[PDB]
Design a protein around this ligand. Structure first.
Ligand code: AHB
Ligand code: FE2
Length: 319
């Protein structure tokens, strides 16, 4: 129940709902009125899909991820893949519709002002000159991370909708769940990961060489079913045992990861409380045919971040 292919009937209904939202709803995706329309439209989805999503929200399973297949994307109408840094989806579209409806089903959408200018629907596309970036515009191997790990109100879910697959065949999303990793880790590493000996900075998407947060543990919550907070690029160990812990953690992420090559109309939803993600190295063409995902973050309890959301909006900033 973590790999869901829409049947023809459900696929046609969601298509209808997404078109209606994209073409008839007033305003544009970042407007509160559009998110409200998306929230109402979500409740028109077939019960089967709403039940699937509700089940995943309640229990994201041993891999902490779900992939839905057969969602609407306008492949014939799709323009060349953007090649600019900071690319975001400001205009109404089927992709924005699918993402924002689903976000309202799982919680609410949200974004962070310093990243992709706080857009609710963000492009994940390779950008010339950014090949070596540990982030959405890169094409070198992207290390495993919780999304925006530094942040107190980091995404609860990360949703990635494929508009255009990587035509080269080398790119794949990788997800690794701590539920697979924990039983395999050495006792010394587990003890290390519970200790406040790890310091984490914002990812480069926020800025370059940003200020690191205070030292804290990687593992959080329940001893048997913990959450985690780590970024193998942005998390610095404060002690020697923390360094070894990170090395062993990395090895087990690699060993336990599931690799997904997404196709158009496929939506991966990663539970960011328990699952890290990364991406394989690939060689972009930079000819408008490259990999194109759109990404929306979900906050399961938007209320918690009110102090960071002026006018009770969907964009989180300082204090
Ligand atoms: N480390 C991360 O969380 C990255 O995915 C970052 N949000 C980015 O878009 O590059
Ligand atoms: Fe990420």
């Amino acid at each position: 129940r973590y790999d869901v292919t829409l049947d023809q009937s459900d696929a046609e209904l969601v298509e209808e709902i997404a078109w209606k939202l994209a073409t008839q709803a007033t305003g544009r995706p970042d407007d509160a009125e559009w998110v409200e329309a998306a929230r109402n439209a979500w409740h028109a989805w077939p019960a089967t899909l709403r039940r699937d999503l509700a089940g995943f929200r309640r229990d994201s399973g041993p891999d902490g991820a779900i992939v839905l297949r057969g969602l609407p994307v306008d492949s014939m109408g799709l323009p060349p893949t953007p090649r600019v840094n900071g690319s975001v989806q400001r205009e109404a579209s089927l992709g924005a519709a699918v993402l924002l409806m689903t976000a309202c089903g799982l919680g609410d959408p949200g974004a962070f002002l310093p990243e992709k200018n706080g857009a609710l629907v963000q492009d994940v596309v390779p950008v010339p000159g950014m090949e070596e970036f540990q982030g959405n515009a890169g094409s070198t191997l992207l290390t495993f991370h919780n999304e925006n790990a530094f942040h107190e109100h980091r995404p609860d879910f990360v949703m990635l909708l494929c508009l255009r697959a990587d035509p080269t065949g080398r790119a794949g999303l990788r997800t690794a769940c701590v539920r697979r990793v924990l039983p395999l880790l050495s006792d010394s590493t587990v003890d290390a990961l519970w200790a406040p000996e790890f310091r984490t900075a914002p990812p480069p998407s926020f800025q370059l060489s940003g200020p690191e947060e205070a030292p804290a543990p990687v593992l959080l919550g329940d001893r048997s079913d913990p959450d985690l907070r780590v970024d193998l690029a942005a998390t610095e160990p404060v002690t020697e045992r923390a360094a070894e812990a990170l090395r062993e953690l990395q090895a087990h992420f690699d060993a336990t990861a599931v690799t997904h090559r997404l196709l158009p109309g496929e939506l991966a939803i990663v539970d960011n409380r328990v699952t890290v993600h990364g991406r394989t190295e690939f060689t972009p063409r930079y000819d408008g045919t490259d990999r194109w995902l759109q990404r929306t973050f979900v906050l399961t309890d938007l209320r918690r971040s009110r102090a960071m959301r002026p006018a009770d909006g969907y964009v989180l900033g300082a204090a």
